[PDB]
């Protein structure tokens, strides 16, 4: 049936309307990176112009409208420096970000993996902002903006909010290079959280 077998949307360009509340419908365009094995309704998408990877149930989320699967399967690119790319995986990093002033701020983070499909991009998360980001880190490294420093999957989670309520979600991925680190998807939001889970 539709989007089955060889028509699987992973690896494809998509576009769709996006609407929140009574706001206007806007067009989102992106590349589908992955389908979550423990929740096959859930896809991971890199949207043009959004630095965070989003998890959306593309066929179920009422905010999504007019979904189009484009005739455009994203080809792999050749990595500019294979040894450097492999070396970054699992490392702590300091990632430089320029701002309004032109002042440049250094954010401590961890390189998680090469991104699927968009294979010159890297999964990365930050100590101060523990969700899943995606950047072409070899470019940033070349420009002097990156310094390299020297099963729970499928389980329901409940995060203890300060107001006494519990935020529900699911563990969706275990980071191969650092298997104490997991991706968590909360039911109420599309960011992918990335945490080193400390047993307690």
């Amino acid at each position: 049936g539709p989007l089955g077998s060889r028509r699987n949307i992973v690896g494809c360009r998509i576009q769709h309307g996006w609407k929140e509340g009574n706001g206007p419908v806007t067009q989102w365009k992106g590349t589908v990176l992955d389908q979550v094995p423990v929740n096959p309704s859930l896809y991971l998408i890199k949207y043009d112009g959004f630095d965070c990877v989003y998890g959306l149930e593309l066929n179920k989320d009422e905010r999504v409208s007019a979904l189009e699967v484009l005739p455009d399967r994203v080809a792999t690119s050749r990595i500019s420096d294979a040894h450097l790319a492999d070396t970054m995986i699992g490392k702590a990093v300091e990632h430089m970000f320029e701002t309004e002033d032109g002042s440049k701020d250094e954010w401590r983070g961890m390189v998680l993996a090469r991104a699927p499909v968009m294979n010159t991009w890297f999964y990365i998360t930050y100590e101060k902002d523990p969700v899943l980001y995606m950047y072409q880190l070899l470019d940033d490294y070349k420009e002097g903006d990156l310094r390299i420093m020297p099963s729970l999957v499928g389980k329901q989670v409940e995060y203890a909010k300060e107001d006494g309520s519990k935020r529900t979600g699911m563990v969706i991925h275990q980071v191969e290079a650092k298997p104490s680190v997991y991706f968590i998807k909360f039911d109420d939001d599309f960011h992918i959280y990335v945490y080193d889970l400390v047993k307690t």
Binding site: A92, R108, G109, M110, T125, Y126, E127, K128, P130, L152, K155, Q156, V157, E158, Y159, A160, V171, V181, I184, V194, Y195, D196, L197, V198, K199, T200
Partner: peptide, 20 residues
């Protein structure tokens, strides 16, 4: 890389998360 405390609740089969 950010850390989170995690305790499995075996009766409810839920991972309880709370900050360090």
């Amino acid at each position: 890389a950010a850390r989170m405390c995690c305790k499995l609740d075996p009766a409810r089969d839920v991972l309880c998360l709370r900050p360090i």
